Design a protein around this ligand. Structure first.
Ligand SMILES: Nc1ncnc2c1ncn2[C@@H]1O[C@H](COP(=O)(O)OP(=O)(O)O)[C@@H](O)[C@H]1O
Ligand SMILES: Nc1ncnc2c1ncn2[C@@H]1O[C@H](COP(=O)(O)OP(=O)(O)O)[C@@H](O)[C@H]1O
Ligand SMILES: Nc1ncnc2c1ncn2[C@@H]1O[C@H](COP(=O)(O)OP(=O)(O)O)[C@@H](O)[C@H]1O
Ligand SMILES: Nc1ncnc2c1ncn2[C@@H]1O[C@H](COP(=O)(O)OP(=O)(O)O)[C@@H](O)[C@H]1O
Lengths: 458, 445, 458, 450
């Protein structure tokens, strides 16, 4: 059993705001539900599964539903959690019979939420994390490969950390689709703030616009529970209409609730994350011999891994030189704040990991000619049921690797300190602009860097 | 049932497999010349290669040089139906084939058939027992073809069942010519290229993904109003059916390729020298194909070699880096295997074989073997493991400096082999032999 | 489900060539299928299972079938591989229902091939090699112990490495039979070359004899695909009859196909193996104080373990002295080539392992009074479901054990160098003879050693 | 409902050779089988379910039968093999009916052979097992009934079948022996004549490991070796050949030892005997054997279920009582040693224990570097110290054991003349019995005994 939406769902792409970089890219999954009789017999093939990735409450389930109602298709939902909570066995059963439930509705959309809770295996938690994930997952993995021609289905997956998933789900036949959603956009914020002000009236003066800029960082489900709260301000005393001075307080109420010990995205938390994101920007960008790419924004959650992972599962000769600057742009994030900032450091880590991983690879798995040779002290596997890293050198050669990666990262970090330092004027320039406007497209960047404005025709 | 067109004169390149196939051809031609004349023939040939290489086209193409009922069954349909009925499609289809002796019985999407609750099993067990029902006084060659035999039911590979395959290596320039020139009959061409410089301006391109290019080239001309395709109509036939596969099928840069081409020469040369030297020969560059091949003899590697060779054999591996280290703009690039396979020798050679370092006759490791699995259990004190480790840097460094030398001291044959390779996207044994031996090769065969 | 041979199999002991050291020793298994009504009620018992051991395509399945048709019994076949390929569970099911399939045919022969794929457990591959082997095997192990009196069955097993099997299969009640097959014999080669020349004629002059000697090393399935290929030489052009000049080429075609990068048993590969096999021979054989046994041949695959394993699973007080020469005859193999040969070494290992295993035993498990005392640094178990070695000393005592077995084997190897060296004339003598005639019975040996001929009469 | 052996069932305890140990223990069933009226009212209780421990063909069934012959009673029989070969419920029925049968024949003995086929641990063996159980669980106070059984491997016998009230007693029957080989051949002497120099004296010896059954079989065949040649009189050269013919057929599946092999174990098992025997400042026990198969089982029973709270001092003799094993041989034997591992292993686990787990005050002292994983099914000890402390422990154990081993080398050497006497007598008579040993030690011959 699961959550069935029969008769006909509401919620469609008209009830979904912004999400362009997703909507149009999903329109082909939709038309398969509409007419699978013009896909099976033509010659092409359809995903059968699509994982969309993003923060908590970005529009994910929202778009998942939206695809069902648009394609006028039954909506099947089940949060991953429910499949592992049980003993060793019933994990497998619940999946098969969810898919003998979804099979009966041809077509339909199945939608597992936090599939996060079924994908991963390595050798870490030996005891009670092995056989319950070994089994349960390798059922969906087999039921999905059960979708041949004349069975129209779309298994949609939600997840807040995409990288923590077993490399077999993104592999052929199974979940072979990549759309993440950076939804808290400017114009998006408006549209979301508009769409969720249909019920309840407002005798306003701000036009929700001056609320968008006063809630720059903010997700839609964040947004909704902002307004819905704003109204209950009135219904708490019985007031006709709610002002925009009743709306600021509605953002000063949700600013201190996400957790248990109350926390926020303060004028110094943006101001940090900004210098930090300018660092990377201002790093990967050079002239004569430097190496990297470009497109700058604030608030992604996932995406900032791109400078390795979604590329090692896409094979090609990278380069010692390339990687080092890669490792440089890695530490840029830190560097930045080390410099500008209050000479204390914010725990903003992943970067270091990416750098460090990139650099034990440096030494061991690749042959990059340290003091360690072109010898192969490791063996990242990439198998059909298995396929993840383990490896043998020997305690000593381990210190040997350790010391080495300290040396490598330290020294490379110092690099990106200088270059940030040396370019210090531009940091303020970028970060400041960044703070102020959230997003710069890279040619826009190209300008702000060469001390020049570029205003929006707004 | 009637005469099925397309012979071996109408299938480009792929000569290797054509030669191996005359075995089915003569037998398909005169089975009476076999049964009584005490012999036996394959029965079940599978094809190994990507989608759109020569595959079905070739199994069909037997029947065209064989003159025979080329029966067909799409494997996808075998599983889409119902219980028993999917297995029925088989039981009936094979009764059908018996009456048409001699013949060929082709199965496409054999993947959909041969994997390892009920669906795929139904058709599988049926397909099996019917193959297990082919007699001496019975003539019948079953064909099939798939991209990934890695995921094919091993039972479907048993002797008596599918106990033979030929690989068809995908593109090649001389094979891209051939193939475009074969699809030249249809409509006119006045362009400077003669599909010569097209076959090149297209890099990795299977045959199918060329027919598709030419089919579209016409619809690029006639939609503009042209009974005559050009270059700027055929080149565009590429970049249009090149930026849609690119999202799921790989492409390489004029640096990427120019690497692999030096890189793979290093190797070739490496295994080639004179006096006090030990190796082999025949070279390629193929985007997807080179991922499968190193893995087959990464599992099923085995003869009882000699210490000396391992030491060339190790350096034939490291020549891969080497080359690039020499020729290339003093950078190196993620190309791991060569090391890994070179280290497992050494690591083996110390530890497991008796090769008389500082380690000598002892057995510091044993090999866990047989079919399904094969990886080696270790057994030494931590110290002896430092020992082994250092060891393996030594043995390999030494070797790598070796092949750096052998390349350097030939670094002019390198940037020739590489260069002709880079140019002609494959040397063939003797071809190489010639390129090495300071001699040009004109417009061949 | 499996491979059933109903109605009546063909292939019998008349269709099996040579294999004497097996045929007569199997004749008692056969007569049980013939008349189980004269075995259940008499007083004796029958194997219920027999594992025969040898190379790839030696006559194994060939003899397995041969036993069935001879005993006029249904033939059940299933290759081990099929039982592990599946998930955790269905491994067990497939065995039980194979044996509820074979139970229905009383009597009958079940024949698992490469049972190699169901027998072994230690603690090496922690992850995905444990519970699929724990279960699946301990089903056949239980179904076989299900064969009481009034259920006639013979579970025949094929395997190319016998030593890699769980010590429980060769244990009581289960597979309690030992016949390996060194089949590529001289007279055997003939008979096999004869038997497989029934179809297709030959206008010969060599009499297949001068082909036997021109294909000394060669197995029967090797042989068969030699002739079957020879004929298709003709059928490729349409030739009546095939010469023996069409037969040499038929061995020059199969000489370069066993693998992917083409390899052979060259005039120097025999010539190596020969000196190698003469080493062991010329080792274990002495006078005054030396220790060992005798019977010399070329091409066994398995057998050359005898100087320990099939004896530690048969309990008795061996001796420090005895073992050292045992360890000596061990390295004889290397030694040999070290000397005669091109002063390069062929990777022919097992010997070393045998030696090394014998000598960590030396130190640890037994009490042989090194610098390590009569202390017990090890505990080879021999249990009823488990039963395999592991043990505890401590890292240091470990380097301690290591250095020791280096000293021990090195020094013992040196010994066997000298003794070979010192007997150098005899090596050439034996090996040369060996090369030339494949097999010397040990009294024949006794002669060739004391510089005397002994030619063959028939 | 299987074999109902009614009437007076022949063969008493006068017709069962050797095995005196068990006969004595069995009079307990005999007197009760003889006069149960003398028990029920006279407030007592008796075993109920005796199982026999020994190989196939020792004295087993023969003895359970032999109770009925000295007990004078209905010796009912049921073959366990047949309990499982039948059908569903029907196999369990055979039990339910057979036990109703036994009740009417009070007093009696109810024997189960092939009890293995019954008591192991989907449906087959369970059927008969649960039935066999509840029927034993239905034997009352005013009810007299002694169930017999006998198997070779109690190791693989369902522990539920060993519960109190069910099968809560067993006697072992040790297989051959020389004085038991005499006894047995002399018992099978009545049949046909003998004029040979041996009087089954020097046969009982010329045959080494030979169960009783594998002797009757020798003598049965000896006659058919004579009369087939035409002889109403068997000889030595007709009885010796009764051996080597029914000796080279079992040899393919049953073990044998060499005039060196045995002469080892005999010194070897002296080494031990002496070892645990001294005077002043010394701590041990006594009673010796040599039996080919039997000595594999016995070291294992107290390798699992070892437990009293000993004293530090003894362990140290107790360790050297173990090492003396090597010792002896090291001394007497042609300066070679032989794979005879256990002694060390068991000597090391003490030491290893003694350091580490017990409090014995090395350099290691009252700390608990290790704990013992216990209870029934399992028992092996978890370790817990830094690598260093493990070198520590290792060295330690070389030290403690070396020292000891040098000890018992001494004790043996400085007695090395009692050795090659106890060994020698053992080697000769294949078992000393407590006092016998005591006497051999104490410079005194022993003539043609009892
Ligand atoms: N794009 C948006 N426009 C309107 N509502 C939104 C939007 N994004 C999120 N929501 C609100 O959030 C709720 C669910 O949030 P969602 O993003 O689907 O959770 P999650 O990201 O964990 O899957 C919806 O019911 C909807 O009201
Ligand atoms: N060797 C070739 N010469 C000419 N055309 C080819 C060749 N190989 C493939 N093709 C084209 O590709 C089409 C299908 O390719 P094929 O390999 O037979 O199918 P698939 O690989 O998908 O099983 C053929 O119809 C043919 O037009
Ligand atoms: N003794 C031989 N005589 C005749 N044919 C043989 C002989 N040995 C092997 N063969 C051939 O080999 C085939 C099977 O080889 P086999 O040895 O049974 O494989 P494996 O050793 O892996 O079990 C048979 O079909 C038979 O034709
Ligand atoms: N103590 C003995 N004295 C005389 N005969 C014996 C003795 N022990 C065993 N036997 C012979 O062995 C036969 C069966 O041996 P027994 O031990 O009772 O059966 P099992 O051991 O197989 O259960 C008896 O019939 C008897 O002839």
């Amino acid at each position: 059993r699961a959550r069935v939406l029969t008769e006909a769902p509401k919620v469609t792409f008209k009830d979904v705001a912004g999400a362009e970089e997703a909507k149009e890219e999903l329109k082909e999954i939709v038309e398969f539900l509409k007419n699978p009789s013009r896909f099976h017999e033509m010659g092409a093939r359809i995903p059968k599964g699509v994982l969309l990735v993003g923060p908590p409450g970005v529009g994910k389930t929202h778009l998942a539903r939206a695809v069902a109602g648009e394609a006028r298709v039954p909506f099947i939902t089940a949060s991953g959690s429910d499949f592992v909570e049980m003993f060793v066995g019933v994990g497998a059963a619940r999946v098969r019979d969810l898919f003998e439930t979804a099979k009966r509705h041809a077509p339909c959309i199945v939608f597992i939420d936090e599939i996060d809770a079924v994908g991963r295996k390595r050798g870490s938690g030996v005891g009670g994390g092995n056989d319950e994930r070994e089994q349960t997952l390798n059922q969906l993995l087999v039921e999905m490969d059960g979708f041949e021609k004349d069975t129209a289905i779309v298994v949609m997956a939600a997840t807040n950390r995409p990288d923590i998933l077993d490399p077999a789900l993104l592999r052929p036949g199974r979940f072979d689709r990549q759309i993440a959603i950076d939804a808290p956009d400017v114009k998006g914020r408006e549209q979301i703030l508009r769409i969720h002000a249909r019920g309840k009236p407002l005798a306003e003066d701000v036009d929700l616009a001056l609320l968008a800029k006063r809630t720059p960082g903010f997700v839609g489900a964040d947004l909704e529970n902002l307004l819905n709260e704003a109204a209950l301000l009135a219904a708490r005393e019985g007031r006709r209409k709610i002002t925009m001075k009743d709306l600021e307080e509605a953002a000063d109420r949700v600013m201190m609730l996400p957790a248990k010990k109350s926390l926020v995205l303060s004028p110094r938390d943006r101001r940090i994350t900004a210098y930090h994101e300018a660092g990377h920007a201002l790093a990967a960008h050079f002239l004569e011999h430097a190496d990297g790419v470009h497109k700058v924004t604030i608030v992604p959650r996932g995406r900032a891994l791109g400078f390795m992972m979604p590329r090692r599962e896409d094979m090609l000769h990278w380069s010692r030189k390339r990687l080092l600057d890669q490792i440089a742009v890695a530490l840029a994030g830190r560097a930045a704040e080390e410099i500008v900032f209050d000479d204390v450091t914010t725990g903003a880590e992943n970067d270091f990991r990416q750098a460090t991983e990139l650099a034990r690879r440096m030494i061991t798995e690749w042959g990059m000619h340290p003091e360690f040779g072109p010898v192969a002290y490791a063996v990242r596997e990439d198998t059909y049921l298995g396929g993840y890293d383990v490896r043998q050198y020997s305690e000593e050669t381990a210190k040997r690797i350790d010391e080495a990666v300290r040396r490598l990262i330290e020294e490379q970090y110092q690099r990106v300190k200088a270059l940030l330092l040396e370019k210090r004027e531009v940091l303020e320039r970028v970060a400041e602009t960044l703070l102020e406007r959230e997003t710069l497209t890279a040619e826009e960047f190209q300008r702000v860097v060469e001390g020049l404005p570029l205003e929006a025709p707004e």
